[PDB]
């Protein structure tokens, strides 16, 4: 109960789309009543709204075009029929959200983006307005749709993004009416459209939208979010500001946005965003891009910001997560790449802070390093054991297994250890014997061997970035492991 | 006769494909004959085709859902529907190609745009295949109809061309079967795509493009078209290729294709693709972008081609048009770009090539300026005249009358002219006396003055690039006027 008592529904979908086309002809505009005709035809909408629920026979839908008709109507003249279809199509889009089966929902999906949804649903969301309680609802149904398109399968969210929906979702957020639940949604859905996809970090810039972002955060500059809603919604806007980031042009243009300067105040007056912008800064230095990023900061007395975060971290513990590893890999990661980028009279400084209160810096990084191999050692016991464990089970290890593995050591802290051996060679090859000495000093005393440090280095080299180029890549590795000589 | 005469065919059409719509879905795939209602709806297509040559009454075409219907038509299992709706669509898009009315057409464009018939021309068109000589016919009408949409509103070509066509476009032309008149309409709509449109030739750059350009011609090397049908396509290849390398990022990859070697080969031997080749060479050149292009040209002895064409122009003439400033016009640019650009050993060469054989090459530049001027002189009196005249009339001199005063200098060989110019001053800013006194020594000898000149520099200077970017601009305006101290 039932199979194609629905094909019905469709038939009569169909039967009624027509005879309200006819009537809608026969009545020039300006006829008052022609209406329950039109009201009558969606009362199926709805009743379909039941369709979804079904085991999905979506191909129906689609063959018998259901979809095609269903778009269609997102253009009508009157809104409640748009609505109504946005309404249900989130309902075969949501469900759809269950694990299976694929066989509806790949065909149906695949209809809709054939049929340009996002480029027809965009064009409703600028008509729908004036906040209605029910054009209200009307949008967010609309956003909906998206996530579960995007979550499902997210490519139709780059060339949908691009139809049209981008470029709205960068409007209302700039829109000066006052934050509501809506406003909040469209930050999710951007994020969502920029989580992986490059094309629209270059789109989204290519509209100013950097000093949209920066100046939403902007406001929250002196004084945290008045509610816990709206604090979601700003850190949606850093994830979305993060991963334009993560495109090299977007750096010039965070830049020219006053991007480090804003990070900068939200990190000098420590609260609640302090976390979030140390994450940015982190992002927009990250390359050989990050490069002019690495002068300004240091210009703007980023080095005066940094660093105490370096010598100690915070908050053993603030309820909000920004701790303990995920601080530490920024910072210094940030130095990593201020070392590895930094030149000229900027570089200097930077060494200098190396060597300050005789080299106090450098004995941090030592305390920070041996925590962190202490952890990876560790880590990598228990693979070895699960690793011997599974020849006895006689289990394969497996691409998929590699996976799960690399995740522990990533979760031990990987990755800040890569950073701060780095960071410890980047200081080496500085020719100043002080640090140096230290360093050495420092592992002699005791029992850790500067060769165990290499054997990191070149973990970090092979994989070194992942990654701009085959050129750009063994280039970059030569660069890392050449400075593995005067270590 | 008529009207709505045919709004009887609208109804009839919609009420057609309902009745197919119902038919298809009683009848399971394999039933063999349900067709005949499927043959006879597009009759009134074929009947409908009629309607477009009525005086236009579009709007009802769109308000009334015709559109719509349409271009959902245009995914149908069977191919002569489709076909048969391209077909329809070509009539009601070439005629509508007539100057007037603007009401029908304005409102008919508008809905395809909305409803993103690209997209759908092209999901078509990739089924399409095998040529058929009835398919075949099918992409040429597909192509027609962006053509007359391209004409008419040239904006719904790069959103359009993006949704797919573009890309299809690249394909067929990539593809190995023979030459055909298909092959040849592709050029003629890629052209059009990227006339001047930044964003389509990011897009074809984007997509190995250049290289299937450049390898299309590749072919035309050594040999000309075996037609004069293949000929108008290699031209149209060559505009293409242009108009990408205006697009700054092109450059680049025109130098990783051999692009600078192909044009050279091309020139080298002397027919009948050099004319174009040395078109394309120029655009490569042209701006702080055609940096690199500028110094590989050196290195690959493009001073050994380009400086012959310089000291003799042909051909005196050749029955395709390459004559005769046109070729003037690219060869100084060239050179022009050369200097602006060139930098270390590389512009040495280029200047020792001015003081060749004495600076013959010194005084074929001041053959070619007192011609252009003397032509320019004249063509600004004529201006003069019709300026009085025009106030004598009592008309007004006017943007429209400003924009037909321009054409007239140019016409005259005005760019030539302060290429020249600024070569001429770019020459005697490197210090070298003879060039120098030569310059002097001839503009005495007689009757020009140097500050004529400088009239010119200045007026090359103000419109200087049309344009990069303000400060690009006045950058640049710096720069030029910089040399006229030392001149």
Request: charged share 30%.
């Given at each position: 109960l039932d199979e194609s008592s629905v094909k019905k529904m469709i038939l009569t979908f169909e039967k009624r789309s027509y005879k309200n086309q006819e009537l809608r002809i026969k009545f020039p505009d300006?006829?008052?009543?022609?209406m329950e005709s039109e009201l009558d035809l969606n009362d199926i909408i709805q009743e379909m709204h039941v369709v979804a629920t079904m085991p999905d026979l979506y191909h129906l839908l689609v063959e018998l075009n259901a979809v095609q008709s269903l778009l269609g109507l997102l253009?009508?003249?009157?809104?409640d029929v748009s609505i109504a279809v946005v309404d249900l199509l989130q309902e075969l889009t949501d469900i759809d959200t269950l694990h299976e089966s694929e066989e509806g929902a790949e065909v149906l999906i695949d209809a809709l983006v054939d049929g340009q949804v996002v480029a027809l649903l965009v064009q409703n969301l600028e008509r729908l307005d004036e906040s209605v309680k029910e054009e209200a609802d009307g949008v967010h149904n609309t956003l909906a749709i998206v996530e579960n398109m995007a979550e499902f399968r997210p490519e139709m969210c780059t060339e949908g993004a691009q139809q049209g929906l981008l470029q709205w979702l960068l409007k209302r957020l700039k829109a000066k009416m006052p934050f509501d639940a809506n406003k909040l949604y469209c930050s999710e859905v951007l994020a969502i459209l920029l989580q992986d996809n490059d094309e629209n970090r270059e789109l989204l810039g290519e509209l100013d939208g950097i000093d949209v972002l920066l100046q939403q955060l902007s406001v929250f500059k002196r004084h945290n979010p008045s509610t816990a809603e709206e604090q979601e919604m700003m850190e949606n806007l850093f994830d979305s500001l993060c991963s334009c980031l993560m495109l090299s042009s977007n750096r010039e243009r965070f830049l020219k946005g006053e991007g480090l300067q804003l990070m900068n105040l939200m990190l000098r007056e420590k609260k609640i965003s302090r976390s979030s912008a140390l994450k940015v800064l982190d992002h927009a230095m990250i390359g050989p891009e990050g490069t002019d990023n690495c002068h300004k900061f240091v210009d703007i007395l980023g080095l005066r910001t940094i660093f105490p975060l370096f010598m100690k971290s915070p908050r053993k513990i603030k309820k909000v997560g920004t701790t303990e590893k995920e601080h530490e890999e920024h910072v210094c990661s940030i130095l990593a790449s201020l070392l590895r980028n930094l030149r000229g009279q900027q570089r200097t400084r930077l060494l200098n802070k190396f060597t300050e209160n005789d080299s106090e810096k450098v004995d941090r990084l030592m305390e920070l390093h041996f925590k962190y191999l202490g952890a990876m050692q560790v880590a990598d016991k228990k693979i070895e054991g699960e690793k011997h464990d599974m020849v006895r089970r006689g289990e394969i290890i497996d691409n998929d297994t590699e996976e799960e593995f690399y995740l522990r050591r990533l979760d031990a802290g990987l990755f800040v250890l890569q950073h701060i051996c780095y960071i410890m060679a980047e200081i080496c090859?500085?020719?100043?014997p002080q640090i140096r000495q230290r360093v050495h000093q420092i592992l002699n005393m005791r029992g850790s061997s500067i060769k165990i440090v290499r054997h990191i280095i070149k973990e970090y080299a092979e994989n070194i970035?992942?990654?701009?180029s085959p050129e750009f890549r063994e280039n970059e590795q030569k660069r890392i492991l050449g400075l593995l000589e005067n270590f």
């Amino acid at each position: 109960l039932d199979e194609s008592s629905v094909k019905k529904m469709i038939l009569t979908f169909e039967k009624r789309s027509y005879k309200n086309q006819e009537l809608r002809i026969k009545f020039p505009d300006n006829p008052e009543k022609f209406m329950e005709s039109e009201l009558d035809l969606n009362d199926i909408i709805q009743e379909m709204h039941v369709v979804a629920t079904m085991p999905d026979l979506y191909h129906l839908l689609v063959e018998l075009n259901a979809v095609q008709s269903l778009l269609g109507l997102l253009g009508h003249d009157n809104t409640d029929v748009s609505i109504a279809v946005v309404d249900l199509l989130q309902e075969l889009t949501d469900i759809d959200t269950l694990h299976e089966s694929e066989e509806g929902a790949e065909v149906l999906i695949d209809a809709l983006v054939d049929g340009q949804v996002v480029a027809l649903l965009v064009q409703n969301l600028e008509r729908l307005d004036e906040s209605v309680k029910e054009e209200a609802d009307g949008v967010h149904n609309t956003l909906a749709i998206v996530e579960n398109m995007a979550e499902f399968r997210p490519e139709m969210c780059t060339e949908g993004a691009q139809q049209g929906l981008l470029q709205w979702l960068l409007k209302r957020l700039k829109a000066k009416m006052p934050f509501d639940a809506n406003k909040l949604y469209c930050s999710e859905v951007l994020a969502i459209l920029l989580q992986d996809n490059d094309e629209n970090r270059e789109l989204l810039g290519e509209l100013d939208g950097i000093d949209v972002l920066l100046q939403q955060l902007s406001v929250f500059k002196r004084h945290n979010p008045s509610t816990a809603e709206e604090q979601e919604m700003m850190e949606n806007l850093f994830d979305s500001l993060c991963s334009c980031l993560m495109l090299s042009s977007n750096r010039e243009r965070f830049l020219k946005g006053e991007g480090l300067q804003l990070m900068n105040l939200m990190l000098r007056e420590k609260k609640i965003s302090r976390s979030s912008a140390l994450k940015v800064l982190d992002h927009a230095m990250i390359g050989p891009e990050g490069t002019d990023n690495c002068h300004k900061f240091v210009d703007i007395l980023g080095l005066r910001t940094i660093f105490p975060l370096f010598m100690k971290s915070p908050r053993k513990i603030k309820k909000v997560g920004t701790t303990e590893k995920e601080h530490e890999e920024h910072v210094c990661s940030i130095l990593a790449s201020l070392l590895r980028n930094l030149r000229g009279q900027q570089r200097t400084r930077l060494l200098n802070k190396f060597t300050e209160n005789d080299s106090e810096k450098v004995d941090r990084l030592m305390e920070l390093h041996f925590k962190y191999l202490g952890a990876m050692q560790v880590a990598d016991k228990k693979i070895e054991g699960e690793k011997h464990d599974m020849v006895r089970r006689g289990e394969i290890i497996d691409n998929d297994t590699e996976e799960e593995f690399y995740l522990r050591r990533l979760d031990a802290g990987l990755f800040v250890l890569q950073h701060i051996c780095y960071i410890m060679a980047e200081i080496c090859n500085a020719n100043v014997p002080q640090i140096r000495q230290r360093v050495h000093q420092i592992l002699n005393m005791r029992g850790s061997s500067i060769k165990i440090v290499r054997h990191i280095i070149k973990e970090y080299a092979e994989n070194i970035g992942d990654g701009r180029s085959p050129e750009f890549r063994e280039n970059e590795q030569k660069r890392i492991l050449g400075l593995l000589e005067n270590f």
